[PDB]
Amino acid sequence: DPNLSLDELGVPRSIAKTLTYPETVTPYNIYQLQELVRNGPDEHPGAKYIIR
Amino acid sequence: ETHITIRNISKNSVDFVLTNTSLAVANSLRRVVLAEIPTVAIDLVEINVNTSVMPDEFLAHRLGMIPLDSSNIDEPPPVGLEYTRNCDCDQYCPKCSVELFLNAKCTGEGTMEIYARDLVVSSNSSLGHPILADPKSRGPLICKLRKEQEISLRCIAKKGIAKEHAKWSPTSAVAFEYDPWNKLQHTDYWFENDADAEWPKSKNADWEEPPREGEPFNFQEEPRRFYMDVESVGSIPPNEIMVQGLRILQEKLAVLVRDLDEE
Amino acid sequence: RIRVMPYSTFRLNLSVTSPYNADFDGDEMNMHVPQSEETRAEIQEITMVPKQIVSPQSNKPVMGIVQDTLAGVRKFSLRDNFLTRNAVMNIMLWVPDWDGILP
Amino acid sequence: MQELYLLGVVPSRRFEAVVNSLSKTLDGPKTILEFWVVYRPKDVPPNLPRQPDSWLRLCSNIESHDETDTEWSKNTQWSMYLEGNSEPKREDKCGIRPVNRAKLTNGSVTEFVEKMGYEFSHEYIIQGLEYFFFDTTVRIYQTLIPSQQRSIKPPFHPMNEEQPWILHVYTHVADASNQVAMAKAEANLTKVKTLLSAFCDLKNVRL
Amino acid sequence: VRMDTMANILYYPQKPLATTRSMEYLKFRELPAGQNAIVAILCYSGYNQEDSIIMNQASIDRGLFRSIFYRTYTDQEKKIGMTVMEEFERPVRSTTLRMKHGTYDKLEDDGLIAPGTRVSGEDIIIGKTAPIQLHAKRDVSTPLRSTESGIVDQVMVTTNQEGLKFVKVRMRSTRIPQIGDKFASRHGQKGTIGMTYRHEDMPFSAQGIVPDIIINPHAIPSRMTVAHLVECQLSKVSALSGFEGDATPFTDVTVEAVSKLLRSHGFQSRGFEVMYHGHTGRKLVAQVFLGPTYYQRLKHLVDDKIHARARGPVQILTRQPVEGRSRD
Amino acid sequence: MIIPIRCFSCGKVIGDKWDTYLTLLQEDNTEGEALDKLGLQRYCCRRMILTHVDLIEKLLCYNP
Amino acid sequence: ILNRLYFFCIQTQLLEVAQCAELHAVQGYYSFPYLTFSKGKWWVLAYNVESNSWSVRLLNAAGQTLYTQDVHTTKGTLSIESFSRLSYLLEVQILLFNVQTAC
Amino acid sequence: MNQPERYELIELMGLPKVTYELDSKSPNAAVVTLEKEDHTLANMLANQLLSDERVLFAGYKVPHPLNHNFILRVQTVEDCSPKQVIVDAAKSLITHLEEIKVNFMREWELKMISVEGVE
Amino acid sequence: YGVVDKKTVGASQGGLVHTIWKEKGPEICKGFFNGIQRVVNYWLLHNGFSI
Amino acid sequence: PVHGVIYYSSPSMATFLSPAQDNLVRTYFAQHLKKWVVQYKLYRNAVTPKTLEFLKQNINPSMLACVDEATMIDAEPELEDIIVRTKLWNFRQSFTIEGSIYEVGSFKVAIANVLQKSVWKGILFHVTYDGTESVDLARPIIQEFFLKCFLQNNKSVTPVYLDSKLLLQLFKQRID
Amino acid sequence: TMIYLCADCGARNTIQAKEVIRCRECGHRVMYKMRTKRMVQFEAR
Secondary structure, rough: OOOOOOOEEEEHHHHOOOOOOOOOOOOOHHHHHHHHHHHHHOOOOOOOOOOO | OOOEEEOEEEOOOEEEEEEEOOOOHHHHHHHHOOOOOOOEEEEEEEEEHHHHHOOOHHHHHHHHHHOEEOOOOOOOOOOOOOOOEEEOOOOHHHOOOOEEEEEEEEOOOEEEEEEHHHHHOOOOOOOOEEEEOOOOOOOEEEEEEEEOOEEEEEEEEEEEEEHHOOOOOOEEOOOOOOOOOOOOOOOOOOOOOOOOOOOOOHHHOOOOOOOOOOEEEEOOOOOOEEEEEEEOOOOOOOOOOOHHHHHHHHHHHHHHHHHOOOO | OOOOOOOOOOOHHHHOHHHHHOOOOOOOOOOOOOOOOHHHHHHHHHOOOOOOEEEEOOEOOOOOOHHHHHHHHHHHHHOOOOOOOOOHHHHHHOOOOOOOOOO | EEEEEEEEOHHHHHHHHHHHHOOHHHHOOOOEEEEEEEOOOOOOOOOOOOOOOOOEEEEEEEEOOOOOOOOOOHHOOOOOOOOOOOOOOOOOOOOOOOOOEEEEOOOOHHHHHHOOOOOOOOEEEEEEEEEEEOEEEEEEOOOOOOOOOOOOOOOEEOOOOOEEEEEEEEEOOOOOOOOOOOOOHHHHHHHHHHHHHOOOEEEOOOO | OOOOEEEEEEOOOEEOOOOOOOOOOOOOOOOOOOOOOOOEEEEOOOOOOOOOOEHHHHHOOOOOOEEEEEEEEEEOOOOOOOOOOOOOOOOOOOOOOOOOOOOOHHHOOOOOOOOOOOOOOOOOOOOOOOOOOOOOOOOOOOOOOOOOOOOOEEEEEOOOOOOEEEEEEOOOOOOOOOOEEEEEEEOOOOOOEEEEEOOOOOEEHHHHHHOOOEEOOOOOOOOOOHHHHHHHHHHHHOOOOOOEEEEEOOOOOHHHHHHHHHHHOOOOOOOOOOOEEEOOOEEEOOOOEEOOOOOEEEOOOOOOOOOOOOOEEEEEOOEEEEOOOOOO | OOOOOOOOOOOOOOOOOOOOOOOHOOOOOHHHHHHHOOOOOOOOOOOHHHEEOOHHHHHHOOOO | HHHHHHHHHHHHHHHHHOOOOOOOOOOOOOOOHHHHOOOOOOOOEEOOOOOOOOOEOOOOOOOEEEEEEEOOOOOOHHHHHHHHHHHHHHHHHHHHHHHHHHO | OOOOHHHHHOOOOOOOOOEEEOOOOOOOEEHHHHHOOOHHHHHHHHOOOHHHOOOOOOOOEEEOOOOOOOEEEEEEEOOOOOHHHHHHHHHHHHHHHHHHHHHHHHHOOOOOOOOOOOO | OOOOOOOHHHOOOOOOHHHHOOOOOOOHHEEEEEEEHHHHHHHHHHHHOOO | OOOOOEEOOOOHHHHHHHHHHOOOOOEEEEEEOEEEEEOOOOOOOOOOEOOEOOOOOOOOOOOOEOOOOOOEEEEOOOOOHHHHHOOOOOEEEEEEEOOOEEEOOOOEEEEEEEEEEEEEEEOEEEEEEOOOOOOOOOHHHOOOOOOOOOOOEEEEOOOOOHHHHHHHHHHHHHHH | OOEEEEOOOOEEOOOOOOOOOOOOOOOOOOEEEOOOOOOOOOOOO
């Protein structure tokens, strides 16, 4: 692909929808981070698993 | 003034020449005609019984490409159905999609040869009816059968543009050739031993200059005069395509203006 | 840095092909995602296609313009090739950080 | 509309005495008179929303209307409610149920729920008292069963005419996303609970 | 008719155009591996780079290199005993144990699926049972690897000896060309698809046809493979002739020979042609070597080679991650 | 199996143009050149009827 | 924003002055802060004032005009606009002169 | 399997077809982003937009052949607008199109007569 | 002066690629590959090239 | 007070020609069809249908036509949408009516660009005028000013009678 | 139980669960399975 910056890598959604990448809950995220869950693990901008 | 100078015509293609216009518009017309020109085509089959040799998957793809009549199209309600996507009805309805049938059986023992003829629309003179490119034949070939191999198919067409699947464009190709000698030198011919000697003059070359001199070559000159040549599939009359080309090309420029003068 | 296209292959950048001594003969390449926010940092500040464009093997670069973009440079850096005002313009929309001022 | 609320029975024997501890110190009294029809959308397939809230509740306020006047059924003001259920894990805490407070304007009124085809179910009438505190209010209950279906004529039918006064402090949030009216109104109405605690014991009940 | 595991056929096979007088014997023209593709060697965009190719979507839409992928699942009915039965009964979620993420909702009363039921995912197709309240029925039935999809060609239930029942299920799964599939000519031009341009974009010129696929010029000079070239100049010449042009290994037939045969039809005695850009309409400065040839749809497609892990199953003995396949 | 119908590069229908094609190269003593009499000026698709294999007559005879 | 208050309250003032002599001051022909002045009932011959300054700037485009600086132009009202029309009649005679100068 | 939805090529997913937004840098110059419609409409307002002496720049370029859109930058400089420069252009186009849409519907039937008839 | 080829935009000793790296570090350094490998590809698109 | 909305095959000009008129202007005139489809069948047509369009007479009542096509009840919510959203109901390609009503004088002209979910439909025009007269004592004469400014490529559709009636009249174009 | 079809004859064998795999008015011992009804959703692409 000629159109990506050098330090760029095209990752197919098929995979992006199956990775992670934990990430603890910051007080800066709560709202942003929540939207992801409410979205679903089948919607790119989503997630899987919630750890307590 | 003029703008077009046609030569020959037929029943499947339309040879002519653009005049007072720019390169852009030319191409932008080539493109238009090859893509976004509403047409009917079948885009969903339900199989009941099929014990033939073509798989279901293989029939869908084949039953698709077979051209259909479209004619007017962009003129509802009748004699034209609007995209089945933005329809006032739900799911799929004859008000925005034309139903087709295929009930082919076997009464022989030799060999069967089912063409595009055997299909059945509905009787809503849409149309509708596929086509019969073949001379006094019956249409494009679909499938072959031997003993008892009846197939039963329900086909319904929608509305779509090449963009959405090459299945729709009612347009074969196009054959343009602005500046047939080499006025503007928009091209560097590869020799190999003698330039104007290896490359063939084109049939459309006999309509211009500027051989001799050594003028030297000009540059204030823009490419005008474009020798196009549109050929249709046979789905919709040979322009048609062209006519309906700008009708949904003007309206594509408009979209713009209206989204800038309202606010 | 991921993101994120569709279709099921890894798109990567041609000038980065030399370091992976491997063409597109249908090759596979592995991806390892970090987890902890403390490694995410290592492979950002030390290991990066950018900070790795010059291996000390030879204190010489290991990536460079190659293939079509290279063949292209010659056939375009020639002083036989002028650009019509008509663009210019068009081609100015890559830079990608444009002064805004037309040369 | 996220209503926040509690519940506490008042025997009628002490009722008006409580009202003296209420209305003299509060807005109102306002007698309530509103004919319910909690139509049930019997529907297919499962899983149905099936929850009591999911069943429709046309809500004809009629408190100013005559007890025998005939124009009522589709001329006097009506409403409709599905409402969300009160929050899970809302122990002792005031229940938080989002509410769609519907309104309507035509000679046709009830008809649309049957234009939605919904079946008739249980019916009653809010008939208690309400005492304001700005957007918040307390709503002590009386819910007599009407003497006949679509009949506005008393006597009606409390499960006992020794009817419990289901006292019910409340408020109505516009949207639950902010913490503001949450803790704020919960505090104000907790203080309202301190007021009633001088004469009553309200509690949360699951919904 | 042959029930057979992993089979790959072509929707539309074709004769090699320029072929050698030594196939009549290899019965090759009768069952081609090839498929003739208006190829054009252009440096255009940048997606057809370093041994890689870009193909025309319009074409793949009408059937370029469309293939089918039959897979077949074998399953008998072991019986040890004593007398231990194990019929293909439909598992009953009333005393099974254990099997979830079915669904068995797709099995008939026979415990077997009926063609051609749209099967996808980890769906199941047969059902087993092995004796041991409510006891006891096990489940030694075989599911379907998620990585596969598509309908079910046909199933064949016969008898073994052995002495029990014996079923075979075959499902078909059309496979279209997608970015990342392999193609190569008959000269070892291992290529992969880099992009799929729709009909307008591609250099419609000037005849005006459109390349079906277009390889990049840097896959020539270093890999010296002047045959790939020749073939294309010759394939073309089965233009206004149809004379199946022989490509016989050692013959008098020469480049200089075919060339004369070229302008003989109005074209350039060398393959080339002028070419019009798809965006603008500008002639391309350079002349393109456009000319048919057949490329082979190689096996091992992409959707079979992608792999992704993340807290997946693990060995029992070592407790580390399983190997390729499985799930996954 | 059977003509492709619709050439690979253009749209030019070819499902119709074969039941008639074969009835010349083996039934009229005209050349491979005869297809020219079917409106095949382009490469193009015309290498469609030409490079084709009739894989159905020889498949159809497996009757179930 | 105070300037908004200024121009707006003055707008209302002039609207009250716009009553008799219905100088509609419709703003479609230009959206400037300078603000259009117009006329009842009405090819078009424009009408503009600002300081206020009685610059009869009839225009289309830009027709041939005529200019005056009478009156302190703070106080109204309707009668002054009537005087503007009284000038505009002589302006029509001048339109006949414009017909004369054409040839 | 990861093939973007084709219908998501001809249908704006709640995406504002057009978007007009100034730049900075450049001064008196804005950038237009038409979506789900490109590679045709774009080329025109260029090889034609540059024909108005009022213009001093004419952007136009698709960022990536996967996203079906494209930007357009115009600079001018100095009086208006440039939302007005491109519209004055678009208008000059639709009207220049009919110029040919009419000649076509005019010369068609005119060379349809010479190939016999009749009537 | 002269003409750009591998001599200068390839891993050369005193290579141009080498020389901005190394003055002033990766980026706009990292952008260099994005510019030329974007500008030129764009030029070439409409310049055409082949054999 | 006869109604007379007209559909047109020559749009765009309303934004352009009406300002070009030398006369006076008022405010907004936008309204929105919203087709509905129940997520299951059963409720398919007539009194108990998939069909529904809350009708956004934004200009005055601010009250939706809570109407399952010829089912006469009206309400502002909106909240009713969510009430309708109990595992239920979808949409279909409705075409919204939006625009541009302006003060004129003896009569006034409502104006609105019309918008299918496929972006465009085609502009509608209307002119309110005194109602004491019989339907055509001057309505064609009002249409002289449909020719002043001149208006072109009009559709034959003719809804006919304040403006609340337009609500049912929406259907007259909706059923098209 | 269900119906089955032979590899040669094709006649309806309509044979019962747990028995013997064969035919009736003929020979050979295999058999495939009738295609379901079944109106199946098929895109044409």
